[PDB]
Every structure is written in structure tokens, then in C-alpha cells.
Structure 1
Amino acid sequence: GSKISFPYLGKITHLKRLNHDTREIQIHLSRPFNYQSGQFAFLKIFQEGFESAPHPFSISGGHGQTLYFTVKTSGDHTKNIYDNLQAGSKVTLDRAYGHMIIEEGRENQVWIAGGIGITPFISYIREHPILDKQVHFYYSFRGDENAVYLDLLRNYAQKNPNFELHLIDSTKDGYLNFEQKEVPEHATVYMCGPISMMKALAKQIKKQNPKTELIYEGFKF
């Protein structure tokens, strides 16, 4: 307990409904905030009609006094977020958490995202406009209407040729599968999506390419 730490006080400045069920929150904080792309944080909302309990969400962009989250409806709080959350509202955050720093991974990196699991990588893309690493990125989503940030990703491919982008619509091709997929020899694979999808892909990637490093963060929708 050798540090006195105060929560990060914030105001919500902008919101955008990216699709039918996912909403992007832009926050201004009272003082600069440390994180590294791939970490999450615990957000507490103070608006009439909202529970103020802390929910974790992956940080999906920002530096300094700007922080972004992208929320997919999955239950009542998130549904309330999509529907009713309002610019002006006060929020606090404790601090960054997680062991998924994309910076610290190898030169070579494979990225796998299922659904709203793309958020941590949007973080990376947003804060590294020119890309240093070598990236194969697999974005899996259930139907075009569950994809987000498409334009941002395509713009990023155009600016960064060392950025290689695969869009899988799982309803077209079936769940992503890495059995007959090879992996760069000295690569780090990062993954984020439904827990069910993580565990299945971990299995497939530790067996085919058992020499690969693999960091993931699951959740349930």
C-alpha cells in the first residue's frame, strides 16, 4: 500500500454507434493516463439510470488525456451503454491492466480477433500510424453487420504494406481454423475474442506450430 492512488476522473465527450450493437465511447480524463495497446481498464459510469459498478473493457485508442472504448451489447449494462449513455457524463477509471502488450512482442506478429476482440488491436493501429512490426491480422466476425472499423483497417493496409489483413465472415466460411495455417517461425501470436474461440485456436496453434509464443485474453459475449 506504498502508493496513494486516485481514480482517473473523466467526462464522456463523443459516442458513435459503429453498428447495430457496438458503440464507441471517447473520454477526456483530468490527467494523463498510462497504458499500452492490448491492455484493458475498469470503467465506472455516473449517469442517472446507469449502474456505477466497474466493468472491464479493452482500451481501443487514445493517448494522454484521451481514452477510447468500444462496447458491444451483451447484457443490460452494455445495452444501456448502446442505448442511453450520454456525452457529459462523468466517469472514472482505476488504471490499466492485462498482460497483452503488443509492443513487447517479436518483430513478427500474428493477430487474431473474434468480434469485439478487435478492440485491443484498434488501440495499436490508432497509436502506431506508421507500423514498425510485421503483422498478419485475422478478423473474424459473424456476418458483415458484426464487423466494425473496416474503413480504418483498409486505410491502415493502404498506409502500411507490412500490414496484412484477412477478413473472415464466420457465417460464410465457418469458425476460423488454424490447422492448415502456418505461422512465421519467430512470430508472436496475439489473440482476443470469445473464450470458446481462444481455447479452440490455442489448441490448434500449439499442436501445428508448438514452438510459437501465444498470448490471449478471452471473454464471454
Structure 2
Amino acid sequence: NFINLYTVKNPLKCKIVDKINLVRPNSPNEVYHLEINHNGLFKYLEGHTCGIIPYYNQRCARLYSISSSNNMENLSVAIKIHKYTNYGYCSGFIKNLKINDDIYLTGAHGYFNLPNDAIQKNTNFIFIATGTGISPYISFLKKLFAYDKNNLYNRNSNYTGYITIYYGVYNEDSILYLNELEYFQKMYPNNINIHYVFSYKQNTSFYVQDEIYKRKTEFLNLFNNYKCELYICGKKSIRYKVMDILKSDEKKKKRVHVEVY
């Protein structure tokens, strides 16, 4: 496996290649996409998180979902900058990062991966996310659809499954990896469908779970009839309402994946 190949006691020294503002000006969020050069040495599968040790050489690491596929030279992450101005520990660190600065990662973590024969089987997917929770799904799509930023005009994909995405963000200027999401949507309209759920519409609260609930029968159809592998990434609450819909098998629980923070 690629898990724990690097730890806080022997982290990988990497370099920042790019740092991009991921949101657009109507967003109340501040989120940076980081392109990180790891000399081909950081090993990972799509869905894995990496740890970043702020100000390394307190030695405390933070987890971040990898937003790139295995085949790509550099790796990437999306980091929301937390504020209370004071910043979160890592938040403050990422904020003052400069291009070509050193950054220390800890070996692959987590098990939020694709089934190992997803392309062969054309397995269908339900991806549910909020905020930065979209990152692993972006890494998933980049793999399944053989994405290439320098070669977007070709395809290239042997994946013929159907992917449904439910994504909750504040507004549309808060949708992360919109470039990619809109691209996949245009290039593969028979393979992918996306429902955005914006929290700004309120002020009743209405979130991504509530949308799933509105589409209960359709959601049940996809999971049951199309044997979708079901993923949840973001708010911890998403769980109960979505799990309830399914309940209303052990063979089924292996098809459900959860990563909340």
C-alpha cells in the first residue's frame, strides 16, 4: 500500500508549483488550489488524503484531499483558509505560502478510494459533497475520464458508467473546480449529471441532504437498479437523512463510503 510511506518523523519535502484562488468574487470563502511537485515520490490512489505539516523545518499535520489523479506529474489540493483577523494554524501557513516554497507532506492516508476495477466494470457512482468535499471526486473523474489539461481536445475515456453528483456550496462563485466540473459535464453529458445545492437561497434551511430527500425515488433508483457505489464527503450531518432513505444489506454497506470533517 501507499499508506504512511511518509510520517511526521520522515515527511516528503515538496515544492509549490502554483497557487490559485479557487473561488470567484461573489464567494464569502477563501480557497487556494495548490500544485505540488513531489518528484514523483509521493505515492497515492485517488481519494487519498495527504498531511501537510505547517512551518516544518509544533510538528502537527493537517489532512487534505488530493484533487489530482495518479498519472499526473504534480499533485494538487484545495485548502479553505479558516478565519476568526486570525487564521487557522495551517490556514495562516497556506495563506503566506509563496510559489517555490518548501512544503512537507506525510504519506497517503485514508481509504476513500474507487473500487479497484471501476474502469473495467464501468461501475456507476453517486458522489455527494459539500465545500472542499468535492476534491476526491475531482481526482476520481480525472482518473475515470483520463483528464489532461494540456490535451483537453481528445477522449480518451473507456469509462461508460453513469456518475451522479450532489454538491452543496454557498453560491455558484463558491463551486470549487468549476472549470473541471463544467468541462466533464460538456465532454461527457451521457456519463455525468450534477445537481448544485446553494445555501444562500435560505434567509427553513435547505441543504444537500434535503435535495436527495426531494429526489428520494430517483436517488433510490440509482442506488438499487444501477448498483451505484455511494460516496459522502463533507458535512457529518449529510449521513442520517441519506442513510435513512436507503434504509426505508451488508452487501449494500460495502457500497457506501463516508469521509466527514
TM-score normalised to structure 2 length: 0.72
**Which residue number in structure 1 is paired with residue 26 of structure 2?**
none
Select 1:204's aligned residue among 244, 248, 252: 244
Structure 2 counterpart of 1:56: 63
Is structure 2 residue 13 aligned with structure 1 residue 9? yes
Aligned in 2, Cα 1:4/1:152: closer, same or farther, shift over 3 Å? closer
Select which of 170, 179, 183 maps to 2:199. 170
TM-score normalized by the length of structure 1:
0.83
Using the TM superposition, name which of 144-153 and 9-18 deviates more.
144-153
Shift of 1:145: 3.2
Alpha carbons of 1:35 and 1:159: their partners in 2 closer, same or farther (altered >3 Å)? same
Please show how residues 11-30 of structure 1 align to structure 2 within 5 Å.
11-19=15-23, 20-30=29-39
Unaligned runs of at least 5 residues, structure 2: 24-28, 148-156
Q: 1:39 to 1:202 in 2, by over 3 A?
A: farther
Contact 1:17–1:82 (Cα < 8 Å) also in 2: no
How many residue pairs end up in the alignment? 214
Given that 1:27 and 1:67 are in contact with CA atoms closer than 8 Å, whether structure 2 keeps it comes out as yes
1:60 match: secondary structure = coil
Assess, with a 3 A threshold, how the Cα gap between structure 1 residues 119 and 7 changes in structure 2: closer, same or farther.
same
- 1:36–1:4 CA distance, 2 compared to 1 (3 A): closer
Q: Which residue identity does 1:119 align to in structure 2?
A: S
The whole-number CA distance in structure 1 between the counterparts of 2:166 and 2:92 is 30
Deviation at 1:44, TM superposition (A): 1.9
Structure 2 counterpart of 1:125, which letter?
A: L
- What stretches of structure 1 move > 6 A for 4+ residues in a row? none
Say if 1:206 and 1:4 are closer, same or farther in 2 by CA, change over 3 A.
closer
For residues 203 and 103 of structure 1, the distance between their equivalents in structure 2, rounded to whole angstroms, comes to 20
- The structure-2 alpha-carbon separation of the partners of 1:10 and 1:56, relative to structure 1 and needing over 3 Å to count, comes to same
Q: If you compute each CA radius of gyration, which structure gives the higher value, 1 or 2?
A: 2
| Superposition deviation, residue 170 in structure 1 | 3.0
Q: Given the superposition, is the C-alpha separation of residues 37 and 99 from structure 1 closer, same or farther in structure 2, using an over 3 Å criterion?
A: same
- The CA RMSD over aligned residues, in Å, is 2.8
Q: 2:41 aligns with which of 26, 32, 38?
A: 32
| Aligned residue in 2 for 1:187 | 228
- Shift in Å at residue 73 of structure 1? 2.0
Which residue does 1:135 correspond to in 2? 163
Structure 1 position 72, deviation (Å): 0.9
Give the distance between the partners of 1:98 and 1:4, measured in 2 at CA.
Answer: 13
Greater helix content: 2
Contact 2:40 2:74 in 1 (8 A): no
Paired position in structure 1 for 2:256: 214
1:63-78 superposed matches below 5 A: 63=70, 65-74=73-82, 76-78=88-90
Q: Which sections of structure 1, spanning at least 5 residues, go unmatched?
A: none
Structure 1 window deviating more from structure 2 (134-143 vs 72-81): it is 72-81
